[PDB]
Amino acid sequence: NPDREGWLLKLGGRVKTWKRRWFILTDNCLYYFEYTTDKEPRGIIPLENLSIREVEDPRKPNCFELYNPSHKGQVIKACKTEADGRVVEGNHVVYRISAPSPEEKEEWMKSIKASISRDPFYD
Numbered sequence: 001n002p003d004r005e006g007w008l009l010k011l012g013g014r015v016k017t018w019k020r021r022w023f024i025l026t027d028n029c030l031y032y033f034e035y036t037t038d039k040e041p042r043g044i045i046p047l048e049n050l051s052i053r054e055v056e057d058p059r060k061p062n063c064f065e066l067y068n069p070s071h072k073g074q075v076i077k078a079c080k081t082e083a084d085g086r087v088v089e090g091n092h093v094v095y096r097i098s099a100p101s102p103e104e105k106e107e108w109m110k111s112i113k114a115s116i117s118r119d120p121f122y123d
């Protein structure tokens, strides 16, 4: 079931704060928890119909983003839980994330392209 896991830094949506989060990529779904032993996902991002792209950030290096080619400037459909556990839809136009190192950043990038590609509903 698992495919790839490791820590990453992601920028919030409405509020632009980076949070260190544990990520798990599986079945073309990208999971992130606050801790590796967390029992439930803090957020879930369905990667279908999305694309990654290298970016340059003025605060964190080794970045890349997830955005929707088809609907530029439109909020990406995701599921997230608030601090208290309340379930809400995500509010990201793009998901910017900085890896700890280039090998990881690129390993994720490829690995995320691998899962999107291993999708029988690709266009």
Ligand SMILES: O=P(O)(O)O[C@H]1[C@H](O)[C@@H](OP(=O)(O)O)[C@H](OP(=O)(O)O)[C@@H](OP(=O)(O)O)[C@H]1O
Pocket (backbone or CB within 6 Å): 011, 012, 013, 014, 015, 016, 017, 018, 019, 021, 042, 043, 080, 081, 090, 091, 092
């Ligand atoms: O705690 P503050 O400083 O308010 O910032 C939060 C965190 O960055 C959240 O990340 P995480 O959920 O990983 O803890 C993020 O939710 P997501 O990035 O998951 O959507 C929120 O986006 P908004 O709820 O859109 O503001 C953002 O407001």
